[PDB]
Amino acid sequence: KDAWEIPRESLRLEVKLGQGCFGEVWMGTWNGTTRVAIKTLKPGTMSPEAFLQEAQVMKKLRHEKLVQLYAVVSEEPIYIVTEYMSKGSLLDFLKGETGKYLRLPQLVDMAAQIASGMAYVERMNYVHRDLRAANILVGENLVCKVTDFGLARLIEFPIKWTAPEAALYGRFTIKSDVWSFGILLTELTTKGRVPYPGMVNREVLDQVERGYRMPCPPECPESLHDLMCQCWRKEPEERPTFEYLQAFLEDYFTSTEPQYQPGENL
Numbered sequence: 178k179d180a181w182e183i184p185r186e187s188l189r190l191e192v193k194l195g196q197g198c199f200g201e202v203w204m205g206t207w208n209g210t211t212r213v214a215i216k217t218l219k220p221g222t223m224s225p226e227a228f229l230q231e232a233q234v235m236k237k238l239r240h241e242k243l244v245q246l247y248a249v250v251s252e253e254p255i256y257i258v259t260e261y262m263s264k265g266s267l268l269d270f271l272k273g274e275t276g277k278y279l280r281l282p283q284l285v286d287m288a289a290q291i292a293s294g295m296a297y298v299e300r301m302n303y304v305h306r307d308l309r310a311a312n313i314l315v316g317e318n319l320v321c322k323v324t325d326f327g328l329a330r331l332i333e334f335p336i337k338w339t340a341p342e343a344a345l346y347g348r349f350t351i352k353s354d355v356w357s358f359g360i361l362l363t364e365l366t367t368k369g370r371v372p373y374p375g376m377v378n379r380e381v382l383d384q385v386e387r388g389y390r391m392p393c394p395p396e397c398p399e400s401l402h403d404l405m406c407q408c409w410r411k412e413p414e415e416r417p418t419f420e421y422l423q424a425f426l427e428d429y430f431t432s433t434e435p436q437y438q439p440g441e442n443l
């Protein structure tokens with residue numbers, strides 16, 4: 178036990194949110210004062226370690242653009258508590274009612290916060306391993322955060338989002354992370370479409386390894402799709418840092434596309 182543990186009776190579960198073969202996720206209150214999100218366990222389903230060693234990683238990380246780990250409880254019902262992100266994943270947010278109103282500036286800006294959260298991950302010497310719209314959460318005012326560190330390791334699998342070297346040879350790096358980021362940019366520019374439309378896993382891996390790359394999304398600026406291609410370089414070390422990515426996105430409409438004019442969708 179560490180100073181991350183709270184009583185169960187501190188809490189209270191209310192409205193369900195998702196289910197799983199891991200447990201489930203609720204809106205809660207904390208000590209009567211704090212809307213939280215609680216992630217329960219189905220007591221025998223996962224290890225004690227397994228369900229939580231994702232959140233040892235969440236103790237050693239702390240950034241505005243990552244989701245805030247609040248507390249843990251470690252006898253079943255076993256829980257982990259976090260800040261409540263009001264709009265759920267970015268995937269849903271992008272497919273939902275509001276998605277179609279989003280244009281480049283809100284999208285580039287969301288990519289920015291994310292890049293920023295990862296750029297911190299980057300300098301904390303870590304890799305996330307499952308980066309994609311659906312592991313990003315949204316709050317109000319278009320605030321995006323990275324979460325789902327359930328595979329996040331210190332540097333001593335969904336292939337569409339995964340880097341080649343990482344899928345074939347288990348070579349995960351912050352640079353493999355950059356690869357996903359680049360796919361995530363295409364989610365953001367398509368308003369949530371699945372990568373490699375009409376292609377199946379083995380088709381992706383085969384074509385990706387042949388050097389195919391997703392082409393420019395409709396209405397997306399070539400400068401934006403170039404950045405993506407930089408992220409998908411066959412050579413991970415030649416792939417840009419997230420700190421490069423963070424600043425390039427933040428300064429996007431001034432330094433790169435000062436002449437951006439809104440279109441039908443973007």
Ligand SMILES: COc1cc(Nc2c(C#N)cnc3cc(OCCCN4CCN(C)CC4)c(OC)cc23)c(Cl)cc1Cl
Pocket residue numbers: 194195202214215216232244257258259260261262263264265266269314324325
């Ligand atoms: C607590 O522990 C963990 C929780 C999570 N997942 C979440 C975190 C976190 N973190 C924070 N906030 C969340 C809010 C959610 O729902 C919001 C309501 C959805 N709607 C959108 C549409 N409109 C119209 C109604 C509202 C949600 O379920 C979709 C999951 C959340 C992860 Cl991934 C890992 C750990 Cl360890």
